[PDB]
């Protein structure tokens, strides 16, 4: 009845009988873990879909407002003014079909690719073969193609957090900082509640949001009732 | 008469049949089975005071026997 984790104390904080609710969560998590540096809490969950038959495979992104600087890099592929807008907006990788060519060669440092409709052909067909089933090629309703290279990369820097059910039907995303206001963690938990809810493919039949919770990096793990 | 019930009347009639369905499913009724039949219960018993019976019929039975069991 004794286990291998010093976290044990934090675990004692952890009383897994209730699934509680969001704001409560902000507070008890914020308290629960501030180990090395300050907790990097995150929320994770699983939906009653079936990602094999991609007719439910979701992803996208809500806009949990709150300053940013880390996670999921992206390539702003376009030309002059777009390099301007998106680069400044908040880009990790920037350029155009020249960057596309560099990638075809041996340079790929971006998980998501967002290109404006001006170098989109070169991006998708030149780099189509390269970014491929990696998730690195631009798609017109996958928050990856369009002129607002600046707007989207911008949010990438000011606050982004995306969605993408993994193999077994679950998503992960940042919806509040560690020492961050409880009500805050609540609100972001929410924006995610919503965009996620929307993504909810019409291919669901019943208890869709099955398990919805807040867990940290290295720390506690408790479900939250995004209802209250 | 010699086989109705004992605890009321359950000895008689029955007109019936069928054919087939497929209605609020895909169409009309495969209609027909001009047939006729019987339709009834069962028998059993207990004791007055050393030496008895009952006879009767099914349910009505069960409640009943309970009743005169009361006496």
């Amino acid at each position: 009845p004794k286990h291998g984790k010093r976290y044990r104390a934090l675990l004692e904080k952890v009383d897994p009988n209730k699934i509680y609710t969001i704001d409560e969560a902000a507070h008890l998590v914020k308290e629960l873990a501030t180990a090395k540096f300050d907790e990097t809490v995150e929320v994770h969950a699983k939906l009653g879909i079936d990602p094999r038959r991609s007719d439910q495979n979701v992803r996208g992104t809500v806009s949990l407002p709150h300053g940013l600087g880390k996670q999921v890099r992206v390539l702003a592929i376009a030309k002059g003014e777009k390099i301007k807008e998106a680069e400044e907006a908040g880009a990790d990788y920037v350029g155009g079909e020249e960057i596309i060519q560099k990638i075809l060669d041996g340079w790929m440092d971006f998980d998501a690719v967002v290109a404006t409709p001006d170098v989109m052909g070169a991006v998708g067909s030149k780099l189509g073969r390269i970014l491929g089933p990696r998730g690195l090629l631009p798609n017109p309703k996958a928050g990856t193609v369009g002129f607002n290279i600046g707007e989207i990369i911008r949010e990438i820097k000011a606050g982004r957090i995306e969605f993408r059910n993994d193999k077994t039907g679950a998503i992960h995303a940042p919806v509040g900082k560690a020492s961050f206001p409880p009500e805050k963690l609540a609100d972001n938990i929410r924006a995610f509640i919503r965009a996620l809810e929307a993504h909810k493919p019409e291919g669901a039949k019943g208890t869709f949001l099955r398990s919805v919770y807040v867990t940290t990096t290295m720390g506690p793990s408790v479900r939250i009732n995004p209802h209250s | 008469m010699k086989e109705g019930i004992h605890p009321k009347l359950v000895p008689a009639r029955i007109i019936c049949g069928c054919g087939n369905v497929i209605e609020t499913y895909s169409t009309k009724p495969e209609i027909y089975v001009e047939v006729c039949s019987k339709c009834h219960p069962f028998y059993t018993g207990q004791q007055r005071f050393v030496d008895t019976e009952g006879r009767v019929e099914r349910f009505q039975r069960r409640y009943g026997d309970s009743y005169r069991k009361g006496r």
Binding site: - | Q46, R62, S66, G70
Partner: protein, 148 residues
Amino acid sequence: MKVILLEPLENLGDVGQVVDVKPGYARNYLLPRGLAVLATESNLKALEARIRAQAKRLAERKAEAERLKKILENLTLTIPVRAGETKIYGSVTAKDIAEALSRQHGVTIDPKRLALEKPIKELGEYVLTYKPHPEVPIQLKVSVVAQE
């Protein structure tokens, strides 16, 4: 199937119970027998009738007990023995006490239940606990002395 049982408790473990044993089952298989009868005002009542019954019974018990508890714990119990200045020649049997309080003073009690392991006969008084009614014991100051 409200089977009310007299001789039953899941076997001949009698009264204080009622269970279900389906139609015929409980019916002619478990109760034709003669170990229980079914609900009804007659039966449920029955339980109520005699339950009240024991309530009053035991209650009463407790009561008479009290009348005697008071009277006795109250009074001193003095008795006459024959001896020198220690144990009487013929042992002091709490039963003896019995005859004593009993018709020598008034209220009576059965020897059996009491407080007396072996004959007590040192002399003078000892006040002991002879439990008369199951949780309410009668305690008393008993002294017998050589009436010389």
